[PDB]
């Protein structure tokens, strides 16, 4: 385990890698909003399908 950990290690500050979580969140939020608005359009269409009958 330690062998692979040292093999795949990069010379750089650790506090910068964890920071990437912010970027990843900012890039996931977009897709999450797109899923919100798609499940919303879906819901709306559904309620219309239950309005017409």
């Amino acid at each position: 385990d330690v062998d692979t950990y040292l093999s795949n290690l990069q010379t750089k500050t650790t506090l910068s890698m964890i920071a990437d979580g912010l970027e990843r969140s900012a890039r996931d939020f977009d897709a999450f909003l797109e899923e919100n608005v798609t499940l919303e359009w879906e819901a709306q269409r559904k309620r219309i399908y239950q309005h017409f009958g």
């Binding site: 650790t14 506090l15 964890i18 939020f29 897709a31 909003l33 608005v37």
Partner: protein
């Protein structure tokens, strides 16, 4: 029950390093420097408080007496030990010491191998680097220099190891002697006003060792008086070893160097024994010592020839002179000439002890010893012989009056009839004043000045015997100039002007001085005669006044004696002028007295000084005058007359050059004493002003004493400084000293004169101070000038630093010009000092120290603040920085060679227990040089300097600073600081490899020396210093040093092995050091995680438990409880702990081992829930109150003016933002800063700084907990511990939203919080929605968001765009969580009515950045219209949605991303039936058919994958938005709008063709469903009427065959481009197909 546990700890600790034995070197250093922290350290406290150490120091002979401790040695060496045991046995066999002492010395040498190696000659690369730095300064030895490899291979040899062991043994002997001497000194002559801990330790040591209790009216001196013979007997063995080296020692080691070292060690031991004996003797001054001991001591001295046999060599003069002086001192002490004469003349028995006077044998022995010493021809016996001669001269007369035991002596050696021998001895001693000269030399070597060989108290108590001898020899030999100069050199010692301080000391130290005014013999013979012989004999009276004013500053009982003598002198005496022969008449009263009376009205200096007619006088054969006057005014008048270059034939003679210099010097010293005693409580603040007024009395109104000094300077500065004789240079030095003295009480006139002094870059006339440069010889005559000028300049700069105020006659421009000239002169002196040839090194050392301190005070004062207060010295600081950071390449080395030479002289100065003055001066010089280097490095780091030419030289200076600490431990902290600053400058600028300059062996030795953080004492200051140094060294690109410091060559002896030992006791360790330890841990983790995290996981059982303990018992609000400043420290510690936990959790997650650790840690976040994201502890109330109170009392100076310029790393203490270190000296001049009962502005400023530090720690904890929770949200994805997790997340969100509303912190001090804590809650709610574990409690959570959106000033399109966007995303996720859940509709309609509409209108008005904001607002409205509470309040919301007429602006913007977003917005608006029909009205169709987009729509290029961006964009805007809107508006009414949609369909058939053609053997399947529903409804309508829907324009054959052929191969053309972060669509598609089967089938 007195073991050697604390004295000699187990060998396992010494070897493993867990406990460094407190060697005698460290104890001696701590006792010599009188350091508070070290003396109060737990280790040294327990070591000294032990009874074993007491018995050892009370019996040093037993420490080295030959004994048989084989059993103890074997028991200690049993349970690298073989080599240690072998060396111990070899040393015990060679030297007569016991085996235990040998083993201890070997262990100490083993622990101190780093120093022994670093004090060795440097390598070849080091010599090459030094030569490159040099471009005088030839203190190297390249002829014998060798490489490092051959130096290390020879270091590990056997012969060299044994030589080093013997050297360490001798050094430890000297250190033990010095330590016990200093301990006795501090215990007997303890200074008052010391720290409570020091007094308690002194009392404990006394009561434990000697039972000396101060609360007893009569302490037990027995055990203290029995310390004289204990060392007088050991001196025998000392001299025996000095005269004969060990026989058992091998002959190969008995080399010249070893013999010299042994002789020096023996001489030092003898001197220390003599000093301890003298101290134990003077402890009981009046009583006599046991004659049984003096007998043996005099026999010893007789035999050894007063140690002249061992001191006869010419290579031990530096140690012989002080040795001879101390021998004479102890001889005169045990002789007690004063008490002896008192007994011989009084005949009364003292009763303290029997004296040698009752033993004739002792008298015979003393007489024969003195005779042998005088016959041998030695100078050391001069004072002792003279004294004895006096005693015999009094015994003879005592026998003549009685013509009892002493008679036996007087008749044994035939000394009764004849008195020839003692008389001849006294004659020889007094001839040529040899006795007086040797006494003066001894006093110089036994004084208080820096030239003294012992400590100040040692010399103060040693001068007592000489003073008593002069007291007792005054009335015998008549008054004469030689005894007077002798007493002057004794009492004054030749110290400088700046050697005067108001430091209160023990009365004992002041005894030697006060005796001049206590005993009548020394009062009516020296003081009275000195006063009477004035100004005729000026030097004695002047020096006496000087020493008295310097010694009686704190003595309030005799503080006005100098003032009284100077203002009310009883008599006058001056030379007689022949012109006055016709102005006197003899009264014929007494011819022997030669009295007379003035007959004419003599007018002197013809208010002016006038003498009344009829004054009596005595002709001293000059004459004395018995007239009362103020000598100060007459001296000032004489100075004025001499400065005016005017001479009066009918007046008194003018003062001589040396006389004028001494006059001005004594005036300056008295003025300084007055200024120092006035500031102290209980004095008079008008003392210096009154003194100056008296000095300027009876003088011309147009000038004062200051003007007199100005005229003197102007007259003496006419010629070139080089063309000046000695005395004129002494006069110039004294006038500069007087200017320095007057700078305090009258800064205005001093600055006004310095503005035109014409001596520093003033004008082009000859006399400038910069012309004294070159390759000259700065002897004592020429050095007293510059050494005073530099200090005068430093005082001027210090006075100018106080720009917040006495100052009549000055201005900003004048002070700025004077400061610039002073800086130029100081820089010229610093550049020229590298060429002068001084008589000694101490002078150059003092000069370098002074100039470096001046430059450092100038540099720090410029960057410490950024307000206008630091503008007076700004041109000067700027000049010095431009000249020390980017100098020209031709004179670049001239400014750097001085520092290199200083470092060389420091790194090759030998260790010596004597001469503490030179040692402390060199230490202060080194510390000043290091501070100056640090200041230059920080200045270069600031202002954006990309190329620092000084770094190349600072690297080769660190090459020497790596070994410099080996000579003195004091340098360990400053040096490290410098290194830290060099590393910091190397970071913000790979850097030059430091290993290439240091070296492998040298670097490893330095690492092994510094790795232990102040182990023998364990102080906090040097600990924080070494932890910041380690953190800075690790943070930079240093990799070799970082690896050698972390690994130790895992870690077994590395810094981390001790950092873990300190971390496992944080519950009791000082919070101040814990912060630095945690900072070091974080610096080692972020850059070297693979090692630190690995070691912590391998030893987590000791760290995780302590972290949990700290977390559980960490209250949130600690201000209210006991402790106010510890709150910030605890917050910083918690922040660092949270950061480390987060980093290790990230590493474990990367290793997939973070589940259990995170699950165990989440239960420790209580302190976080208490004092985490909540930053409301800013308490702006008290800050505003302090600001108002400071602006009301200080209109000119503001509270923000004390803001730091970020020059030095801000401390997390009472000086985080406000510069207190400078304020203490800047605002403490007027009443209000000090305050009663420790109140005022100081305490409030300290509380404000503590609050700011607490806020900074809270922000750090905020970031740490943000990262921790961000990673935990991903870690804790499974369905467990959901309750506590959601509770914690919701509490954090609520605290953030509440802080966003409550009082905000300032933006100039801290970073703007806007957009810093919004994304935190944003991502938290994001992940919680992804997990779908919310309690749908938005009923209260949204109120804070609404209040924030209302009270944000609506910066929709302002600079605060990130803040607006994050608030919008937060409210979006909040309303989405609410949708998942009635009392909600009334609470969420506020956003639909006031927020969405206002923001949309603002965006539509600005757009005339915008795309993303409009899309976010559209998404917000879409997700908000989905709450269940809106499906019933549609009626209520129709009016609010119609009031703003948003549809008009939407259609306007639609008339192409903006059109897309407007279309989506109107679509989501149509989600409500009323709004659906409103959009379905003809308002829509008009623009739908008139839109300019129809231009691109009619073109056949439309398509989903069309190459053109416009075509694809239009196709998407039509597919994703137009069809749902069509269906929505058809739901309202279809029968009426069917013609319209039919016409739209046949007007643009290209869209239908593209939709039915792309799909061949998803957002388009929704289109198919919409078309199917439209077909169904239009067919149902057409079934009744035929007028409408003329053509369907739609095919069933093709579409049916398509849906047939599309119901694994489906993945052929499924390449989703948009979503790439997340089975997804197939289900939806099949659903739509079912819908088709439900509408078409």
């Amino acid at each position: 029950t007195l073991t050697d546990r604390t004295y000699l700890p187990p060998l396992e600790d010494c070897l493993t390093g867990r406990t460094v034995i407190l060697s005698w070197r460290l104890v001696a250093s701590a006792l010599e420097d009188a350091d508070l922290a070290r003396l109060t350290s737990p280790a040294l406290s327990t070591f000294l408080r032990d009874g074993f150490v007491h018995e050892l120091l009370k019996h040093p002979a037993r420490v080295f007496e030959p004994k048989d401790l084989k059993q103890e040695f074997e028991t200690k060496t049993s349970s690298g030990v073989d080599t240690i045991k072998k060396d111990a046995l070899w040393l015990a066999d060679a030297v007569a010491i016991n085996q235990v002492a040998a083993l201890r010395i070997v262990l100490i040498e083993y622990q101190t191998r780093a120093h022994s190696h670093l004090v060795l000659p440097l390598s070849t690369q080091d010599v090459a680097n030094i030569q490159e730095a040099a471009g005088i300064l030839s203190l190297l030895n390249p002829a014998s220099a060798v490489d490092a490899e051959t130096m290390w291979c020879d270091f590990e040899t056997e012969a060299r190891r044994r030589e080093r062991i013997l050297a360490t043994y001798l050094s430890e002997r000297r250190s033990f002697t010095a330590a016990v001497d200093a301990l006795v000194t501090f215990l007997l002559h303890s200074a008052p006003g010391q720290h409570k801990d020091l007094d308690s330790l002194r009392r404990a040591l006394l009561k434990d060792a000697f039972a000396f209790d101060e609360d007893l009216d009569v302490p037990d001196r027995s055990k203290l008086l029995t310390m004289a013979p204990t060392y007088m007997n050991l001196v025998e063995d000392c001299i025996a070893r000095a005269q004969a080296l060990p026989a058992k020692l091998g002959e190969s080691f008995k080399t010249e160097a070893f013999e010299l070292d042994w002789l020096r060690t023996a001489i030092t031991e003898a001197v220390h024994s003599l000093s301890i004996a003298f101290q134990a003797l003077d402890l009981d001054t009046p009583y006599f010592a046991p004659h049984e001991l003096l007998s043996e001591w005099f026999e010893l001295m007789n035999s050894s020839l007063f140690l002249e046999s061992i001191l006869g060599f010419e290579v031990v003069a530096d140690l012989a002179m002080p040795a001879r002086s101390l021998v004479s001192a102890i001889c005169l002490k045990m002789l007690n000439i004063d008490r002896t004469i008192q007994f011989l003349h009084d005949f009364d028995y003292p009763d303290g002890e029997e004296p040698y006077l009752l033993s004739s044998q002792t008298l015979n022995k003393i007489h024969t010893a003195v005779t042998n010493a005088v016959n041998s021809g030695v100078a050391a016996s001069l004072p002792v012989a003279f004294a004895w001669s006096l005693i015999v001269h009094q015994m003879h007369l005592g026998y003549q009056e009685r013509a009892s035991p002493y008679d036996d002596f007087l008749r044994e050696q035939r000394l009764d009839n004849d008195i020839a021998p003692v008389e001849q001895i006294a004659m020889l001693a007094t001839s040529r004043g040899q006795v007086y000269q040797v006494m003066s030399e001894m006093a110089l070597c036994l004084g208080t000045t820096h030239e003294a060989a012992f400590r100040p108290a040692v010399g103060a108590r040693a001068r007592l015997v000489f003073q008593d001898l002069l007291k007792r020899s005054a009335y015998l030999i008549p008054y004469q100039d030689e005894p007077v100069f002798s007493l002057l050199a004794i009492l004054a010692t030749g110290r400088q002007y700046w050697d005067v301080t108001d430091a209160l000391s023990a009365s004992s130290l002041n005894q030697v001085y006060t005796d001049m005014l206590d005993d009548e013999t020394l009062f009516t013979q020296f003081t009275m005669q000195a006063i009477n012989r004035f100004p005729y004999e000026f030097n004695p009276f002047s020096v006496l006044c000087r020493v008295l004013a310097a010694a009686l500053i704190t003595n309030k009982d005799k503080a006005d004696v100098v003032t009284g003598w100077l203002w009310r002198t009883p008599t006058l005496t001056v030379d007689w002028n022949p012109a006055w022969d016709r102005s006197y008449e003899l009264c014929f009263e007494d011819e022997n007295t030669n009295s007379f009376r003035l007959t004419r009205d003599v007018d002197l200096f013809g208010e002016r000084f006038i003498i009344p007619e009829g004054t009596l006088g005595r002709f001293v054969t000059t004459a004395r005058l018995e007239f009362e006057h103020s000598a100060l005014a007459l001296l000032g008048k004489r100075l004025e007359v001499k400065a005016a270059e005017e001479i009066c034939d009918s007046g008194m003679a003018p003062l001589d050059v040396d006389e004028q210099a001494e006059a001005v010097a004594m005036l300056a010293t008295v003025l300084r004493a007055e200024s120092l005693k006035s500031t102290a409580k209980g004095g008079d603040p008008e003392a210096p002003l009154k003194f100056l007024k008296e000095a300027s009395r009876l003088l011309p109104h147009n000038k004062d004493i200051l003007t007199v000094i100005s005229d003197t300077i102007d007259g003496l500065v006419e010629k070139e400084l080089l063309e000046l004789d000695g005395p004129q240079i002494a006069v110039l030095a004294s006038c500069l000293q007087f200017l320095h003295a007057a700078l305090a009480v009258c800064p205005g006139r001093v600055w006004a004169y310095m503005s035109r002094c014409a001596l520093i870059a003033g004008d082009a006339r000859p006399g400038r101070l910069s012309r004294i440069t070159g390759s000259l010889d700065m002897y004592a005559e020429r050095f007293d000038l510059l050494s005073s000028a530099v200090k005068l300049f430093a005082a001027l700069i210090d006075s100018a630093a106080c720009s917040a105020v006495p100052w009549l006659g000055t201005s900003e421009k004048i002070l700025s010009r004077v400061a610039l000239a002073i800086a130029q002169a100081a820089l010229d002196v610093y550049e020229s000092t590298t060429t002068w040839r001084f008589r000694s090194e101490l002078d150059r050392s003092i000069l370098v120290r002074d100039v470096v301190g001046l430059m450092h005070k100038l540099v720090v004062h410029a960057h410490t603040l950024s307000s206008h207060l630091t503008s007076t010295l700004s041109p000067a600081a700027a000049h010095i920085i431009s000249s020390f950071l980017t100098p020209p390449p031709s004179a670049s080395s001239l400014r750097f060679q001085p520092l290199l030479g200083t470092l060389l002289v420091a790194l090759i100065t030998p260790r010596a227990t004597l001469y503490p003055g030179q040692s402390r001066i060199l230490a202060e010089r080194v510390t000043s040089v290091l501070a100056f280097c640090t200041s230059l490095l920080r200045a270069a780091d600031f202002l954006g300097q990309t190329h620092i030419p000084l770094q190349t030289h600072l690297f080769q200076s660190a090459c020497l600073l790596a070994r410099l600490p080996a000579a003195n431990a004091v340098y360990r902290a400053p040096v490290l600081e410098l290194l830290r600053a060099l590393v910091e400058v190397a970071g913000r600028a790979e850097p030059p490899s430091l290993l290439g300059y240091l070296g492998s062996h040298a670097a490893r030795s330095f690492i092994s020396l510094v790795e232990g953080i102040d182990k023998p004492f364990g102080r906090v200051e040097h600990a924080v210093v070494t932890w910041r140094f380690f953190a800075a060294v690790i943070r930079n690109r240093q990799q070799w040093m970082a690896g050698c410091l972390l690994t130790g060559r895992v870690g077994e002896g590395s810094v981390l092995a001790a950092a873990m030992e300190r971390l496992r006791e944080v519950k009791s360790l000082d919070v101040q050091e814990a912060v630095a330890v945690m900072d070091f841990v974080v610096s080692a983790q972020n850059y070297w995680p693979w090692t630190i995290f690995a070691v912590r996981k391998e030893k987590e059982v000791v760290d995780a438990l302590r972290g949990y303990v700290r977390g559980l018992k960490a209250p949130g609000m600690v201000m209210k409880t006991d402790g106010a400043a510890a709150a910030a420290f605890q917050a910083r510690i918690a922040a660092y702990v949270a950061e480390t936990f987060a980093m290790q959790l990230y590493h474990m997650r990367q290793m997939r081992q973070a589940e259990k650790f995170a699950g165990e840690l989440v239960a420790d976040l209580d302190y976080f829930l208490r004092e985490g994201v909540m930053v409301w502890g800013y308490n702006a109330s008290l800050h505003g109150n302090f600001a108002r109170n400071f602006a009301k009392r200080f209109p000119g100076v503001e509270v923000d003016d004390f803001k730091r310029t970020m020059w030095l790393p801000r401390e997390l203490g009472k000086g985080y933002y406000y510069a207190l270190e400078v304020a203490e000296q800047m605002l403490g001049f007027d009443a209000g800063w000090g305050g009663v009962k420790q109140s005022g502005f100081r305490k409030e400023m300290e509380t404000a700084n503590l609050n700011l530090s607490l806020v900074e720690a809270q922000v750090s904890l905020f970031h740490a907990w943000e990262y921790l929770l961000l990673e935990l949200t991903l870690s804790l994805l499974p369905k467990k511990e959901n309750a506590a997790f959601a509770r914690q997340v919701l509490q954090v969100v609520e605290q953030c939203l509440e802080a966003n509303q409550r009082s905000q912190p300032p933006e100039n001090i801290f970073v703007v919080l806007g957009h810093a804590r919004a994304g935190l809650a944003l991502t938290l709610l994001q992940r919680l929605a992804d997990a779908n574990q919310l309690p749908r409690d938005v009923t209260h959570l949204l109120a804070l968001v609404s209040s924030a959106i209302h009270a944000v000033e609506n910066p929709f399109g302002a600079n605060d765009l990130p803040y607006f966007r994050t608030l919008l995303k937060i409210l979006f996720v909040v309303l989405r969580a609410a949708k998942q859940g009635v009392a909600i509709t009334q609470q969420v309609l506020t956003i639909l009515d006031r927020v969405v509409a206002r923001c949309f209108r603002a965006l539509a008005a600005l757009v005339h950045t915008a795309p993303e904001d409009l899309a976010l607002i559209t998404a917000i409205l879409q997700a908000c219209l989905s709450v269940p509470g809106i499906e019933q309040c549609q009626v209520q919301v129709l009016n609010i949605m119609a009031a703003h007429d948003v549809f008009q602006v939407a259609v306007a913007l639609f008339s192409p991303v903006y059109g897309e977003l407007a279309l989506l917005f109107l679509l989501e608006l149509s989600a409500l039936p009323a709004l659906a029909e409103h959009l379905a009205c003809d308002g829509l169709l008009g623009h739908l058919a008139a839109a300019r987009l129809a231009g691109y729509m009619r073109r056949t290029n439309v398509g989903p994958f069309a190459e053109n961006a416009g075509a694809a964009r239009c196709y998407a805007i039509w597919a994703k938005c137009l069809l749902p809107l069509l269906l929505n508006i058809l739901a309202a009414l279809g029968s009426t709008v069917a013609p319209e949609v039919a016409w739209v369909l046949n007007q643009f058939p290209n869209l239908l063709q593209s939709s039915v053609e792309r799909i061949e053997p998803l957002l388009e399947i929704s289109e198919i469903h919409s078309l199917a529903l439209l077909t169904r409804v239009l067919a149902a309508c057409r079934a009744q009427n035929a007028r409408d829907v003329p053509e369907v324009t739609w095919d069933g054959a093709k579409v049916l065959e398509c849906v047939e052929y599309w119901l694994k191969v489906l993945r052929e053309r499924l390449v989703p481009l948009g979503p790439r972060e997340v089975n997804r669509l197939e289900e939806k598609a099949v659903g739509l197909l079912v819908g088709v089967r439900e509408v078409l089938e």
